[PDB]
Amino acid sequence: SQFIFEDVPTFNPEVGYVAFIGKYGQQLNFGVARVFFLNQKKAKMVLHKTAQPSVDLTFGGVKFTVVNNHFPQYVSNPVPDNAITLHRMSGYLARWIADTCKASVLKLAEASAQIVMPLAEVKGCTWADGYTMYLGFAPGAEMFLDAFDFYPLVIEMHRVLKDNMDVNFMKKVLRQRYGTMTAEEWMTQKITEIKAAFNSVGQLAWAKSGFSPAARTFLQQFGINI
Amino acid sequence: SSQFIFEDVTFNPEVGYVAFIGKYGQQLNFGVARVFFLNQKKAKMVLHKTAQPSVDLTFGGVKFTVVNNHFPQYVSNPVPDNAITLHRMSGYLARWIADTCKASVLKLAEASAQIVMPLAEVKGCTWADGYTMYLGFAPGAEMFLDAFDFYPLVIEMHRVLKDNMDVNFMKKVLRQRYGTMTAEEWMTQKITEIKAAFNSVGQLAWAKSGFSPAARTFLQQFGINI
Amino acid sequence: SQFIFEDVPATFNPEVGYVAFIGKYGQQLNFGVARVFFLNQKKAKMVLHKTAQPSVDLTFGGVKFTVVNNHFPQYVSNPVPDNAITLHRMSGYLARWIADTCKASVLKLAEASAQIVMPLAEVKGCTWADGYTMYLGFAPGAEMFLDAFDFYPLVIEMHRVLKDNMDVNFMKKVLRQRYGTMTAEEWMTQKITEIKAAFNSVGQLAWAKSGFSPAARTFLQQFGINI
Amino acid sequence: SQFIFEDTFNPEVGYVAFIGKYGQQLNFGVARVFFLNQKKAKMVLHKTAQPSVDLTFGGVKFTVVNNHFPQYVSNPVPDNAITLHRMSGYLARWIADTCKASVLKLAEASAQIVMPLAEVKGCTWADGYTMYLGFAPGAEMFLDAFDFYPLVIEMHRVLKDNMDVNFMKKVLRQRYGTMTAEEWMTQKITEIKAAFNSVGQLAWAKSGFSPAARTFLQQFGINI
Questions:
Q1: Which of A76, A98, B26, C157 has its CA 20 to 30 A from that of B147?
Q2: Are both C154 and C68 inside the same structural domain?
Q3: How far is Cα C137 from Cα C145, in angstroms, rounded to an integer?
């Protein structure tokens, strides 16, 4: 039925992260994250197909209670600020690796071996380019522009420029804080380091995914550009 | 063998409004309209799915007999001049709020609090821009170009220009009267006030709705324009 | 009988087809019949599309025609006999019939003027005042008889590609037609003078953008909207 | 299992499989019906909610994987299966191989088989079997057998017909016998430009208009 309609009458990522670590922190290792970031795309699909508002997903051998944000019906439902979606959980895992890494070269080599960000590899970015950039490709990492030196922001700037991503997907990022500053503040006081990060990712073999360089050169000869 | 055989065989919005008010007027309040305009898009979808030429829809707690104009089969069927489609009813509700408002600041504040026009908010238009423009975004408000100072007309001119709306959806509007004048008349005698209204809505953060001014300046520096 | 595909097994002279048409239905015709046909042709095409029967009996005015169902999805590609009538052919024949019936009497021309309406002509602001060959020339099928309609069917279609941006491939057929005794390869040369004349004549019709008055199209231009 | 996460196609083998299974039942009448109804069959597949379906062309029943129903597009296809696309390619290859070796056989094909996609662009058996059959969907799998025609034909659709360029991603990954795409893009540009130039002579948008008709229309400012 419902030929009847009636009236429809906050989130701090830094606290959400501390909550996340509080609950799952002891059980984490790079094997877990490796599996998460290789299967994040897959997990989003099963969430889409599954009619259950919260579900228990297991990556590596660690079970996470995740809010189903993706099943058609639930997209518009409010999410609690101490919950995790795949997006948040992606951001938190990325932050966790970032924090774990910086403080040891032994730890950085371990991550380099285990962890893969498809979204980074597609654009020809690797650990050699540095953890903040490489991990910056992870969904959710825009919550922590501090920790990833603005890479998440500039990476999304390039997708609209080069890959013709819809501009509206940047609305969110441009509301984020940089540690203690407002977006309305760091857009001003941080353009120097932002243009630097922008220029740095701008050096990555970014590609029209699915045409090799040799294929582009080939087509040019018959007057076809991409 | 009844249709393998062929042989031989004007709506006034101002009277329709009076009819509408005549029937449903006593039961209206801004809460009803609020629910209507928040769920109009939804109601159009259920009408599309529902195989029943007239249906009883209830907004707030008020039941309206509405002609199903949207189910694939019924689009081309003639509609009586004392009936209401979602479109008409949207127009009448908008007109009712416009008339109710103009005459009192107390009444205008009440509407400002209760009523939301998604189509206005998407393009960054609000009550602050004035009731004629804001309410002008409501479907059906083109019936009353008088009452909404041509806004409904120019708004649709911008959608074809900026949003690449199909031009054929303007056929109807360009047949409307402006109080006592024919479309063939106001297209001439009213281009000055029309270009003014056109220019006014042309100032609304159309694609820029949801990007602060500081965010737009920021993106410009990396050659991204909104 | 839907996961199964099978049977698939170019002469046609419109002037003989017309004689056949008249031979069979001629005695029963009058302008009332045609009036109903041309007002309902579009409707009849839709019911043919919905109806699963390879030939059907359609009745316009009070006259029953055996018409080959060319339009039902399944039948589009099957061959049509040269002594059969589709809605297209029948439209052409009816138009020819009215043209022939008219020319020979002013009394008869007035009768047609009162009865018969060509939607496709009225949309572009053409009327009987402009002359029967032009007005009737708008009828589908009339390109079969470029002789009888002084090339109007051909030039009318030239304008739809120019002004209305019609697909050019719908002209393939017309450019293969004969002008009485001449080949297309011949009248494209020997008849350009009268063709440019006909072209120019229809080019004077208020070729209105369908659904938008001329004043509406001028208006929108001022805000940089073109149709 | 679905909530738990822990840690190839060779057209030449597919063809051999295809022939292995359906080869004895084939004839030009079957292909004729397939290629005239391929567009039709794609539509019914789209409407039909059944991941594999039995389609019959001429009087031969083929088990075909439904690649087209909205839900199934993204599902992996086995390497020994046939989609309409593959099956189109294999049939085209089969006719190509069958023809080359006999003039009697070529005349039989000429009479029976029609490639709509070729006829639309004014290409016929007179232009040669490689080019004509090259128009068949799936024939890009065998750029060897059809002398690069499938590839250049698709280059023209993006140039002349404004086809979306992304539909060329696949073709540009194909092998030319023993070479990689990364190889023949270099070593074969001479023969590729030749094939490109050859199809570039076909009455592309002019199919169905005599020369005299084109000259005529020019006079009223209509160009083909």
A1: B26
A2: no
A3: 9
